[PDB]
Amino acid sequence: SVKEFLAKAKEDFLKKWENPAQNTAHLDQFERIKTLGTGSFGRVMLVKHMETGNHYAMKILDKQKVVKLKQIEHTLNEKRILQAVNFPFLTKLEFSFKDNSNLYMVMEYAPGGEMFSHLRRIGRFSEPHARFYAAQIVLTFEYLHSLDLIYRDLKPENLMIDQQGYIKVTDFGFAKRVKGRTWTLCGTPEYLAPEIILSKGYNKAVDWWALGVLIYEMAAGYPPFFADQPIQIYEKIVSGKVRFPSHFSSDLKDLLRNLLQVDLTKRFGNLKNGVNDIKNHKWFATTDWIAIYQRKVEAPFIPKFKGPGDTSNFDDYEEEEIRVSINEKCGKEFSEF
């Protein structure tokens, strides 16, 4: 049963949520190999865990920079959620720790690269290819939302491809445990629900809207609302108009009309029957939900294995020292980390 599985997952989550793992490794247990991606207050590096020889992705945040960007609470959210959570289609937190200068989150390494890189190169995904990925997101949101978590940053840049060609959602820097509504202006312009841009209190429905943006982008090769500047994107998102490619199937267009619905009483995922409205839509008729969860379905794209520690599916970034001050920074701000 889905209800039964969720019930026991929430039991597992709550224990870890209320008593979070802390200080479970140290920087010099890892060999730093290469930068896999960059962000505002931090980067992500391929590292090797020397004691086991396992490869991992280590997220490094400069505490001083987190503070300047007013992301203290959000960073504490990210770590506290990721250590508590456990689901096949999320990058699992293996270790976390901090030193005088930085915060560290060590997650499983997905060597396939970002969906973003593959989507841009290939141009667009076929509907079966798009549906495969979409299903994995549908299930991840079902899991997360059942734990009262909102994700708030769905986009291809945040979806890593694993050696089996399945997805891992990563970057929980805006994820939050909220019962009820919340107000923070955050996310990525192309993927923002109308609620958010109009400064309403909002809820998990914004994640289902974001799913509609992603499915569209995967299947079209470009997003449903784009312009050169964010303001122009926001004017389009709140206009209530959306244009589908002629190659989009009837089923696709109708799923997206119900996902990209400005009206919350009508938006799929946010209705009385919740996520099943999405799972039982015709576009997903071919989808064996349990076989996807079980990773039994054959991936439409299996990434090139060139060994462990291969990074050829990721772009190159300018490498930058991990400097560790002799003085502790922001001890109080990050005490619970």
Binding site: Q71, T184, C186, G187, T188, P189, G221, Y222, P245
Partner: peptide, 20 residues
Amino acid sequence: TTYADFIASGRTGRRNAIHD
């Protein structure tokens, strides 16, 4: 074409999160 306008836009690279 819509594809052409996208590819010619400034937002075909990785997109950064916003914040208030």
